Design a protein around this ligand. Structure first.
Ligand code: HEM
Ligand SMILES: c1ccc(-c2cnc[nH]2)cc1
Ligand SMILES: [Mn+2]
Length: 466
């Protein structure tokens, strides 16, 4: 087995992880190496911590490690059996991947929904404008949460609500925050198999409530669309994912039931929420803390969009510094520092070490992003290091893996980047910013809080001035 810290009876290595396990893994793998045995109670895990080993796992043996480790909370409403995010690589999974790649996140699809999202950006712009007038600091975490939810809502369901904080959106927010609370803490049933039949913390149960609420909203939206289309055969086709769902179903070309699609949209909606929400806050945090870089971005934006207040997504190639900023934010702050778990589908040897069937595989992309042997001045925020640099985050550069790589690489990436780029652009271009209070400034930026997404312990609060 790969080397690693001495595992104690019963607990294994669990007592050493602390509140930011990804940080502790990063420090540990310096001692033990880029393939490391970690015992999470009875749940044997191998941590992968270099570009070399990432490629060995995700690429060379990409099929063997194409499986997922399934938390107990994922068993709610039988999601573990239905979801594109957790099913093994097989027929049902390929079909849903195909639908995502070829239809949902295609170029045609993303461009067709560009206007729907534009309104949501306009709403955010107006919100920040009010706070700007009154001189009130904006809570970036809360603002980004709502904007992301809006952008995701607009793209998936065409929801054109006129209030920034619409009722429909704040329901979602309650539900998503709900899921995060439950999953973001250790389920001991995940680590001690004798506890699984008990669900001793009621994690599965509490999650079944929030999954149910969410599946309801979605099945509601679907049913309403199906009726509206039946009653209005001559209405223009909506430009969203929901419209795409209906057509695929009513064409019956895929061996998939209805709940595949309702669960699929749930994964898309949830998968895109916390990720973009915390990334936007990190972006804004980094720029405010590095006034030189904030200036360089502002200058590039001024030069390209001028007096336009909302950039066209199609204008992204005209914005290399904005891309570099987001690339660099992903390097330092991958939302999921340990990505999503993979799993060995059979015994497999890697670098002389046996990796047994069933092993949980965690890619520490966080570690890799901050490894000084790969990145110069790793803790420094420096977008300039990506300019004229072919290194990207699509999965081909194992120095930079915030989206994963190989088989289960993030399918929502085309929507994600648009959301990151535009929301960041809207905020930076239209306002200047100062901290509400710079007294604990440095500390507030460095302090992380683990969970579904690693985020700032202290939520960013900054005042918008024009
Ligand atoms: C905004 C930044 C985002 C990041 C950093 C991110 C990151 C990731 C990562 C690391 C994985 C696992 C990759 C692997 O196992 O190799 C993943 C998978 C996934 N992501 Fe995201 N994601 C983001 C946004 C989104 C969005 C906007 C959506 C949907 C609209 C989405 C939907 C999904 C889904 C459905 C999977 C499961 C893929 C599978 O197992 O086949 N993500 N993501
Ligand atoms: C519960 C936990 C995680 C997820 C998910 C994150 N990214 C895709 N799916 C969905 C439900
Ligand atoms: Mn089950």
């Amino acid at each position: 087995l790969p080397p690693g810290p001495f595992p104690y009876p019963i607990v294994g290595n669990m007592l050493q992880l602390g509140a930011n396990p990804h940080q502790v893994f990063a420090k540990l793998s310096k001692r033990y190496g880029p393939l490391m045995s970690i015992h999470l109670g009875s749940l044997y895990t191998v941590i992968v911590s270099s570009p070399e080993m990432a490629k060995e796992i995700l690429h060379r043996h990409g099929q063997v490690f194409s499986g997922r480790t399934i938390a107990q909370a994922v068993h709610a409403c039988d999601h573990d059996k239905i979801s594109m995010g957790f099913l093994p690589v097989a027929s049902e999974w390929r079909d849903m991947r195909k639908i995502c790649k070829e239809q949902m996140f295609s170029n045609q699809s993303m461009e067709a929904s560009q206007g729907l999202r534009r309104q949501k950006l306009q709403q955010l712009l107006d919100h920040v404008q009010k706070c700007s007038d009154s001189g009130r600091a904006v809570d970036i975490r809360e603002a980004a949460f709502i904007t992301t939810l809006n952008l995701m809502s607009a793209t998936l369901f065409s929801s054109q609500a006129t209030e920034f904080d619409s009722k429909a959106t704040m329901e979602f927010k309650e539900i998503i925050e709900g899921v995060a609370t439950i999953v973001g803490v250790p389920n001991f049933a995940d680590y001690f198999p004798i506890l699984r039949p008990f669900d001793p913390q009621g994690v599965k149960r509490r999650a079944d409530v929030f999954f149910g609420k969410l599946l309801a909203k979605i099945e509601g939206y679907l049913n309403e669309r199906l009726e509206s289309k039946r009653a209005n055969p001559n209405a223009p086709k909506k430009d969203d994912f929901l419209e795409i769902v209906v057509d695929i179903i009513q064409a019956n070309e895929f061996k998939l039931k209805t709940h595949h699609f309702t669960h699929l949209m749930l994964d898309l909606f949830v998968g895109g929420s916390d990720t973009n929400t915390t990334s936007i806050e990190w972006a804004m945090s980094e720029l405010v803390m590095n006034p030189d870089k904030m200036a360089r971005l502002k200058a590039e934006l001024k030069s390209v969009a001028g007096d336009e207040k909302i950039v066209d997504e199609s204008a992204m190639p005209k914005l290399p510094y904005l891309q570099a900023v987001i690339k660099e934010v992903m390097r330092i702050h991958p939302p999921g520092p340990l990505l999503l778990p993979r799993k060995a589908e059979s015994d497999q040897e890697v670098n002389g070490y046996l990796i047994p069937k069933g092993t949980q595989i965690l890619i520490n992309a966080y570690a890799i992003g901050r490894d000084p042997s790969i990145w110069t001045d790793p803790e420094t925020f420096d977008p300039e290091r990506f300019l004229d640099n072919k290194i990207d985050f699509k999965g081909q550069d194992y120095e930079l893996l915030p989206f994963g790589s190989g088989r289960r690489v993030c399918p929502g990436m085309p929507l994600a980047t648009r959301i990151l780029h535009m929301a960041t652009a809207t905020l930076v271009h239209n306002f200047d910013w100062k901290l509400e209070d710079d007294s604990t400034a440095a500390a507030d930026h460095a302090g992380e809080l683990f969970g579904v997404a690693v985020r700032r312990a202290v939520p960013l609060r900054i005042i918008p001035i024009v």
